[PDB]
């Protein structure tokens, strides 16, 4: 695709050091600061159950495919204005590719 595909082992330590603190990937996993990313891909924005999203994340309603997903991670607040995802973003394309490769396999 547009975004290619990287190492999923390097994507595992990018998540553990930059995303685990607020997100959990496992099935039926607990929401903490941010939602449980299980089956995030193919699913619309703002639709994981039992989590209270900011109205911005729900009225954006995009279908998370690995392309708009990379446009999100590079600068979250520019993509979804008013989002409470307190993050600067991943500015390097391999870090994005390495991470989404892991996220697509871990979020299946």
């Amino acid at each position: 695709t547009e975004f290619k595909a990287g190492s999923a082992k390097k994507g595992a330590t990018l998540f553990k050091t930059r995303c685990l603190q607020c997100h959990t990937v496992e099935k039926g996993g607990p929401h903490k600061v941010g939602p449980n990313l299980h089956g995030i891909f193919g699913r619309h924005s703002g639709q994981a159950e039992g989590y209270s999203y900011t109205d911005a994340n729900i009225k954006k309603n995009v279908l998370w495919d690995e392309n708009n997903m990379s446009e999100y991670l590079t600068n979250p607040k520019k993509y979804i204005p008013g989002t409470k995802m307190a993050i600067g973003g991943l500015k390097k394309e391999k870090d994005r590719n390495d991470l989404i490769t892991y996220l697509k396999k871990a979020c299946e």
Partner: protein, 294 residues
Amino acid sequence: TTPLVHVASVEKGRSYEDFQKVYNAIALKLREDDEYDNYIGYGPVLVRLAWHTSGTWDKHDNTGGSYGGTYRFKKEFNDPSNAGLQNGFKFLEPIHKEFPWISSGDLFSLGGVTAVQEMQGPKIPWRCGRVDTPEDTTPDNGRLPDADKDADYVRTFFQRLNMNDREVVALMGAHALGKTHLKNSGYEGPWGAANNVFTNEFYLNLLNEDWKLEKNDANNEQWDSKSGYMMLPTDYSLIQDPKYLSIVKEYANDQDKFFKDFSKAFEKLLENGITFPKDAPSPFIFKTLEEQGL
């Protein structure tokens, strides 16, 4: 001896849809010429213009304000703290030769209302009736606030505009829009990532980021974050002051409350000094381009 009573007069034979069409013209040009200042657009600088023409009001002797449309005269135009706004005027000029009947102040203020609404912000009630006043009632430079100061200054400064704790904390959130240009005021950088969309970003950034103090290329000091953002000393003063901190924290969790407080506070600012007759029309609430088909 009393100050000046500026009685509001509706422009000769006009009403709602005449003003709605002035909205749609500024709104159409807002979306079509969105190349400006590296794709932020003209939106933020128009609200900054509706504030800088309104913030020249002093309650004691009711001088200045949005009424007279006194930005057009050199003295107010070339105010040091009024730098960069020229482009905001340049924008509104071709629309002022499309509607020569509307007053300069009535149009300047309308520019901010239409800027915020088009930027997906709250719908702000607007009133007409401002009349153009001559060159000698042009306010003298320095009335606008100074960025390099603290909590006590912003409180006492805003007392002049008849704004309280709740109101100044609501008015400052307009800083979620645009950026500070070093060529204009000696400060650089945005307050958030979404520059052209009106949200509660300003507060969420104020409390969730890690702020450090540093000097810039025009040797003024400012607060900067790792994510590449910035806050003025007058902006960071909103979380030093314990009374302002509670209101910042409140607007952070509930955007709707902020949206309602901002419209009340923004309208009041643009209506300051104006004394409306009770045969004047009830405030106009305009429909955005998204609701009006486009």
